[PDB]
Amino acid sequence: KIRTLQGRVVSDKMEKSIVVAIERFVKHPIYGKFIKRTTKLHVHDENNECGIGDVVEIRECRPLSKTKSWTLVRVVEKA
Amino acid sequence: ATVNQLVRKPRARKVAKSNVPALEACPQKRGVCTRVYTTTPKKPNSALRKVCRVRLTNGFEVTSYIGGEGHNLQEHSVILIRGGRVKDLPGVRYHTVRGALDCSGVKDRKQARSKYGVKRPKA
Amino acid sequence: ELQEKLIAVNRVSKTVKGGRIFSFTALTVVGDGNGRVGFGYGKAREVPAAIQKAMEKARRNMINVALNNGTLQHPVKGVHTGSRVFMQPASEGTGIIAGGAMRAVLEVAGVHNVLAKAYGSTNPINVVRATIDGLENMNSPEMVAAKRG
Amino acid sequence: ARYLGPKLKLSRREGTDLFLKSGVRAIDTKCKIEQAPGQHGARKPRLSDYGVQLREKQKVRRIYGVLERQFRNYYKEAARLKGNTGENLLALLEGRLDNVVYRMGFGATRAEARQLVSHKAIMVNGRVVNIASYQVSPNDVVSIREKAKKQSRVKAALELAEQREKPTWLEVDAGKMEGTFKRKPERSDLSADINEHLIVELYSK
Amino acid sequence: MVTIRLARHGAKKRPFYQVVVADSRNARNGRFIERVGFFNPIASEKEEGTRLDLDRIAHWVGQGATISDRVAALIKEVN
Amino acid sequence: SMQDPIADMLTRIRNGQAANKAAVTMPSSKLKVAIANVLKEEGFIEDFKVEGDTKPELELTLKYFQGKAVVESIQRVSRPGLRIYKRKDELPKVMAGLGIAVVSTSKGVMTDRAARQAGLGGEIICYVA
RNA sequence: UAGCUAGUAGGUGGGGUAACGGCUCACCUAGGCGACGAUCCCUAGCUGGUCUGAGAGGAUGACCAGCCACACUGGAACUGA
RNA sequence: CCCGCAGAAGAAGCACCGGCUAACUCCGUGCCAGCAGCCGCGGUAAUACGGAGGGUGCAAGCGUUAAUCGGAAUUACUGGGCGUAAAGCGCACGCAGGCGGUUUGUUAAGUCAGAUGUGAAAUCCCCGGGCUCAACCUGGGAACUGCAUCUGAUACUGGCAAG
């Protein structure tokens, strides 16, 4: 339990590894406008139990691989 | 403008350039006296002025006005530059340090001494 | 009584078949130091007769403007036809931190504590029109409360 | 670091008399006031807008003897303090050491009392002060030290400023060595000709 | 090896230290875990020329910080 | 309106403040009842009546005291895409506080005194003067 | 400067460091990043703050203080907390 | 730092003076010598060049040059414009982007509120101390506009559900 960062799945062409974007609002720092900004971070998961297009809950973990330091906890959305 | 036209590219500047290119971030550079030329100003003026092209030490060569009231220049020695362009002569964007290395003062001014090589007269 | 002040004097020419006939302009304001202000405009063919005729122009058509504490109380923006004037109410003891023409209209109202600014054009014919419109648009707390309820 | 050579011709520039030479007949023209600022003397002074502000900044500087580095520090201090910028600026002028020693009887003129400050004579509240801007706090005694109580000129000074107005904001013993900076000198008990508008509106840019 | 030495933020010939609970090997005066207490050798009835909040030294002695000489002056130069 | 219902209303009202008509009318959402139930109460206009149930729509009565008209300078500020969510200790006082500042609070729209009484600000709706 | 990238991107394994690790070596998988500006060439040490501006904002990083980088120029390591 | 003795005794420059910009008159020179930041001055009476009296401003420094912001609303979010003053692609559907009619339910991310963490000390700022004052040294506060978490709020906005 951190914030249980909600996100999506962008692509799975990898072996037990997925790609998650995260919706995120912000004040633009000088103009005062809300730009919907998204990030992109690799997430470890073993079962392939989430498909390309779901909605995913994520916490951190030990840094397993290169470029990937987040384990799946559970899924709240089918494809 | 629209807010989503300043977002995707910022307000760019209105860029300002230098017009004393004998900076190299410095105020005074040394020069070794190419010649002395005596060219003429434009239409509202007359009475041809005293200029010298100057071999710098950064690598450049440029011209400079030799103001005062008469000068003293044999032309294979040292001067010192000041900036602050003459309006009249096309190409002279400098001055000379009136009273410096090898370019001595003017012959007895008595008002506004310090901007020329004139010191306290006798007292 | 009243209190005069000049603004400027130009070098207004003209052209006839003969030559270049000159003239002179004279911009003045008049306000008794209690809130009412007025202005005028008048020409001549020499300097001192222009003032004499334009000074009476302002001794009528003085408009009713109320003040609060020798100062303004709420930030009206004034604009008239070439120029923008931004008057912010300020503290007592502050001087009239102002540019050109509105200095002449504020030290005749009774106004003495205003910081303000001319925003765009700096042409003193059209500047002095705006600040009189700026003080015309204002409302005292009486004009606030009695009008809404 | 003060104005040395002539003294009354500067009053001929600034209109009314500045109290540099006073107590004698030089009130009524031992120097021809308004007749000779210089070579081109009695002339046509066709004034301007910037002038009637610039005259006032060099009115009250020259009534006290304060140059331009020092007078701006009194200005910039007169913004951070609470109240009127102008009135605090006159309050900060009146609290000056030399201004107090003058109109607490001592000395013929302010330039003398300044020299009487700078020659080890004056003593504030039991403490020797030879700095002409020790800015006096209320309820403090002024005092001349013992070795210069009566030398020449002390006793003849009080009588001249006693025909002048006795000010409210100070107490003074005409007998000896005792004063009180009482409270804040207001606008009412000023010289009433100095226009504080024309200094606040000068340095503001 | 944590120490309770004194810094030096003074004028020229007018020292005015700071009671500084810091590390051994670090700067002359450039680094501290935290700062509590101050000092002055120009007291001469100015005010209290020492004011320490002794409980916080009694905290950091309990961690194990070795104490230095001129503070060891102060703990008896205060009561 | 197409793309702000409250901005395009605020063109419709003060055009009545430029020809001095008696009654004005705009198609009225349930937010729009909660708009002019502030302007009436603070005194800027006088009376309003909702009508219609397939086109719920208002009958606002204007207020011009003279040739002078009472609602002087109303301005929407938070326009869609430029939300300015004010923290309450920044609050816009309108014309040195002499007007009112309609703020979309939690507890309603009626906002002069959210500065002290309610105690929570939000999105500005429009300044009113 | 619009394409870049094979130890590259991922997984079992051994091997490896004080520690997770593609940190390395065989094997399988074929990926990874990119218009929300990747690779590219040019330039620059970063912050607390200094200067200026009423404010926002604008140029700056000398001094004292935080943190890395470097010891004539390229390399590799030994000891050692 | 305090104290003793001489004797006005050792101690005043620097730029400007046509306009902006506070201060002016004369000799010399006559489109030559020269000034100058822009406007410009000099071709026999120069308040502008050179000189002299007098004046101005500042001061143990004053001018000049170089360098950054300010005036510049002259890259403008608070604070611009485009019919002719520089500026509406020759014109069309449109992908990714930006933006919501209208009612109810609901969630609490946007935002508001409340605290609790934390934003190193030193500068900036306000009351207060100490150098004979001031620069400077300094006690405590406020501020550091920040980010992350719990609790609360449902009017606007946002995803889900129903019209």
Side-chain angles (χ1 to χ4, degrees), chain B residues 21-60:
Chain B
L23 271 163
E24 303 294 325
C26 299
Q28 278 76 242
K29 306 303 287 184
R30 194 175 69 243
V32 206
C33 282
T34 299
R35 297 290 92 186
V36 169
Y37 295 107
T38 319
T39 65
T40 62
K42 297 181 182 181
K43 293 185 264 74
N45 286 313
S46 177
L48 79 176
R49 273 79 184 268
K50 292 94 172 65
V51 295
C52 58
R53 288 181 68 251
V54 167
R55 178 176 173 85
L56 273 68
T57 68
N58 56 0
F60 292 162

Side-chain angles (χ1 to χ4, degrees), chain B residues 37-115:
Chain B
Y37 295 107
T38 319
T39 65
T40 62
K42 297 181 182 181
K43 293 185 264 74
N45 286 313
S46 177
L48 79 176
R49 273 79 184 268
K50 292 94 172 65
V51 295
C52 58
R53 288 181 68 251
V54 167
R55 178 176 173 85
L56 273 68
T57 68
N58 56 0
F60 292 162
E61 289 180 354
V62 77
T63 182
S64 176
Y65 169 63
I66 319 169
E69 186 176 0
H71 71 89
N72 188 5
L73 288 179
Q74 190 55 252
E75 306 177 6
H76 292 85
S77 294
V78 180
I79 53 98
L80 196 60
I81 315 167
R82 194 174 69 87
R85 64 177 294 160
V86 181
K87 177 63 177 66
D88 299 332
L89 300 169
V92 180
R93 61 178 75 254
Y94 294 101
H95 201 271
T96 57
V97 179
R98 188 72 269 165
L101 277 74
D102 187 81
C103 49
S104 66
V106 296
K107 267 72 70 177
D108 287 331
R109 292 292 302 275
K110 293 179 80 175
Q111 287 180 354
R113 290 190 296 274
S114 303
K115 288 186 281 187

Side-chain angles (χ1 to χ4, degrees), chain D residues 38-86:
Chain D
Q39 181 66 259
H40 304 87
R43 294 295 184 185
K44 301 293 288 184
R46 297 295 296 270
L47 71 162
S48 69
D49 194 4
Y50 177 78
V52 303
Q53 293 177 355
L54 196 272
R55 294 295 97 194
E56 292 292 322
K57 187 262 289 293
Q58 298 189 3
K59 182 179 177 181
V60 74
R61 279 178 65 249
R62 287 171 169 181
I63 199 170
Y64 291 146
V66 174
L67 295 177
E68 189 62 34
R69 287 289 93 193
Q70 189 170 359
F71 186 74
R72 295 180 70 248
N73 301 127
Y74 290 98
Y75 180 70
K76 194 177 289 184
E77 187 67 29
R80 65 179 296 172
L81 298 176
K82 186 180 290 295
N84 186 2
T85 303

Side-chain angles (χ1 to χ4, degrees), chain A residues 19-37:
Chain A
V19 177
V20 172
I22 297 168
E23 55 89 21
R24 181 176 173 271
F25 274 167
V26 70
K27 293 287 292 295
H28 191 279
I30 60 169
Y31 293 105
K33 191 259 173 61
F34 295 94
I35 302 169
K36 188 182 289 182
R37 187 173 296 278

